[PDB]
Amino acid sequence: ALQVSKQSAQDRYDHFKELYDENISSTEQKVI
Amino acid sequence: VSESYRRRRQEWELQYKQAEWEVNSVEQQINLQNMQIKAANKRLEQVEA
Numbered sequence: 001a002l003q004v005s006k007q008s009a010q011d012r013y014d015h016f017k018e019l020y021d022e023n024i025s026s027t028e029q030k031v032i
Numbered sequence: 033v034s035e036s037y038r039r040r041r042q043e044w045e046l047q048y049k050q051a052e053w054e055v056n057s058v059e060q061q062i063n064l065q066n067m068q069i070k071a072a073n074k075r076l077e078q079v080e081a
Contacts, residue, residue, distance in 0.1 A: 001060030008053040015046060028035065 001057065001063070004053055004057040007056065008050070011049065011053065019042075
């Protein structure tokens with residue numbers, strides 16, 4: 001059952017890495 | 033202003049994913065105690081016998 005702990009923590013690692021890291025482009029920068 | 037929508041969206045979306053894995057997790061208690069109770073019930077065999 002505790003394989004759900006790796007499910008959650010892995011998804012968190014993925015989410016936050018994709019979130020913060022290498023953010024880029026006009027999708028945000030459009031107004032500047 | 034168009035990004036504020038996405039920003040507000042994503043925290044709720046990720047919290048819902050949180051709830052998903054949390055409910056996946058809690059099954060442990062269900063099976064743990066099911067086993068516990070069935071074994072303890074059988075343990076009365078030693079006493080009554």
